[PDB]
Structure formats: structure tokens, C-alpha cells
């Protein structure tokens, strides 16, 4: 009586149940694991807070309306302030982590709409100015708020044009990245497990984000007659196999 459909994920002191899942994706078919010695470089023993950092943090909720263009969060940024995960983050020189991402959106059998939930490794954004204008730090570190693709261009911020993925590629091809759809008629959640993907064994958690999670409405939300025209979307994310190394004074970052 197991269905692909019902699932339970327990991680730390927190549990999620979905009764309307559509399997789960594990990026590149690899599950998060700690850093092996053969791959290690820094000689420091690392710190593995385990259950105090590897639990589920639910970010603040978004509201899908007929005019929504899509939202974008960066990792580990989105979690920069969650509990002890965040403290560890500002206090060590280097850290490394994988995540379980669970995006939630329920409706009824009269609604229609379909969101794309995708994880993009190394999502370098484009400046809407063109040329070689850079995208300032603050703009690519929105924190739990994430970036709202239907917000206005700002100065020093990225471009927010959806048919171009914020980088000069077409929305249609985002499907080459680990992703899952939430089609109100099928699905009510999306779950993706992200292994740590980098060109170095461990890195800085503040100067470099290693994935952007993106939720994009593709088939517009259509509510039943005289229904309220909107649904909330909630994102809950859990660091998994986290390791921190090179402890010290506590980083100070712009803004």
C-alpha cells in the first residue's frame, strides 16, 4: 500500500509528511555524503553539529497569484539566519552541506496551475544593465526573502526576466537541471535532495552560493469560480551532512 504518493522525511527533530508527492529527485543521482580524506585539503578537523543543523527550516511563505513571475532563493544564503545553522556559517572560515528541499502548494480538484521547481548549480546571474555591469553582493544575497522575479529592476541588482533564467538561457531548457513540477491536478509538493557540488572540497559559505532553488509558475494559476484568486507556496529546506571548518572570529558581511 506504499504509494509513490505518500512520504515521510524525518531529519533531526523535525518531520514532514506529504500525502500527494510525485516521487523525489536526487540530483545527478547522488545523495549528500561527508567529505572524504582522499579529497581533503585543509588540515583542520571539521565540526559536524549533526542534528542541531540538519533539521528542516521553513522559510516565510510566498503568494502565487495570476500575475506571479517566479521566485529565486540561493543556498546557503536562504538559511544564513536559521538557528545554529546560521551561527556556524558566520563563525567558520569554510563549511560544506547538501540539502533536502521540500516545496509545498495545495489547492483543490477544481484549480489548475503548474510550477517548475528546479535546482541550478552555480547560477551566475546577469546584470539588467548589459555590458559588464556587475550584480552587487546584497542583490545576490536576498536571505530568506529570496528574489521576486516580478519585482522591479533595481540598480546593482540582477535582471528578473523569466524567459531567460536570469542569465541568457531559455526557460524551456531548465529541465536539463534536477527539477520536479507541482501540477495542482497531480502533485502538491516537490522534493529534491541536493548533494554538495563544487570544484573545491569545501568553500566559503558567505562569498559563494552553490545552488539557486527556483520556483516558477509555468501554467498560470486558475482558480474555480469566485474562488480567491491566489494560493500560498511554502519552501522548507534542511541542511544535510553539514560540516564546518576553520573556526574563529565571525564574519562581517556587507549590508
Amino acid at each position: 500500500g506504499y504509494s509513490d504518493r505518500v512520504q515521510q522525511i524525518t531529519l533531526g527533530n523535525s518531520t514532514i509528511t506529504t500525502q500527494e508527492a510525485a516521487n523525489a529527485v536526487v540530483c545527478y543521482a547522488e545523495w549528500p555524503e561527508y567529505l572524504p580524506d582522499v579529497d581533503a585539503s585543509d588540515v583542520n578537523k571539521t565540526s559536524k553539529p549533526d542534528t542541531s543543523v540538519c533539521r528542516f527550516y521553513t522559510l516565510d511563505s510566498k503568494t502565487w497569484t495570476t500575475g506571479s513571475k517566479g521566485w529565486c532563493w540561493k543556498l546557503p544564503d536562504a538559511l544564513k539566519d536559521m538557528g545554529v545553522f546560521g551561527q556556524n556559517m558566520f563563525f567558520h572560515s569554510l563549511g560544506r552541506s547538501g540539502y533536502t528541499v521540500h516545496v509545498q502548494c495545495n489547492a483543490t480538484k477544481f484549480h489548475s496551475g503548474c510550477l517548475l521547481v528546479v535546482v541550478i548549480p552555480e547560477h551566475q546571474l546577469a546584470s539588467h544593465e548589459g555590458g559588464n555591469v556587475s550584480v552587487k553582493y546584497t542583490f545576490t544575497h536576498p536571505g530568506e526573502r529570496g528574489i521576486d522575479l516580478s519585482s522591479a529592476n533595481e540598480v546593482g541588482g540582477p535582471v528578473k526576466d523569466v524567459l531567460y533564467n536570469m542569465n541568457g538561457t531559455l526557460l524551456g531548457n531548465l529541465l536539463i537541471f534536477p527539477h520536479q513540477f507541482i501540477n495542482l491536478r497531480t502533485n502538491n509538493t516537490a522534493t529534491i535532495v541536493i548533494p554538495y557540488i563544487n570544484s573545491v572540497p569545501i568553500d566559503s559559505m558567505t562569498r559563494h552560493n552553490n545552488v539557486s532553488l527556483m520556483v516558477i509558475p509555468i501554467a498560470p494559476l486558475t482558480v474555480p469560480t469566485g474562488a480567491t484568486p491566489s494560493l500560498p507556496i511554502t519552501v522548507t529546506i534542511a541542511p544535510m551532512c553539514t560540516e564546518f571548518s576553520g573556526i574563529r572570529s565571525k564574519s562581517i558581511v556587507p549590508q
Binding site: 500525502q19 528542516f56 502538491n188
Partner: protein, 59 residues
């Protein structure tokens, strides 16, 4: 609720030492379960024994 409705609730247990949570952000950092309302009608949350002292007073 009617069978054709849907809902997602979070239940949170806050262990001794902090105040009753004031918003979900605060609540979600302690013992919690996201409940997805479905065919299976009930959700069973456990308040695991979190304690220094091994017995508490009933009063």
C-alpha cells in the same frame, strides 16, 4: 473538513526554556511535523520526553 478541501498545518513542540512561540518562524525551530491533510485523516505528533530532571510534578 469536506473531502474536496486541502490544508497543510505545522504542529510544534517547544521544549522548556523558551517562551511559547510567537510566529511560525519561531515555532518551526523546535520539534515540529508538517501535516498534509489527506486521505489519512489523523496525524499523530509525539512530544518526546525532553528533560534534565527525570520526573516532573503533575501539579
Amino acid at each position: 473538513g469536506p473531502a474536496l478541501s486541502s490544508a497543510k498545518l505545522i504542529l510544534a513542540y517547544t521544549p522548556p526554556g523558551a517562551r511559547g512561540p510567537q510566529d511560525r518562524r519561531e515555532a518551526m525551530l523546535g520539534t515540529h511535523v508538517v501535516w498534509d491533510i489527506g486521505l489519512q485523516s489523523t496525524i499523530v505528533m509525539t512530544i518526546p520526553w525532553t528533560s534534565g530532571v527525570q520526573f516532573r510534578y503533575t501539579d
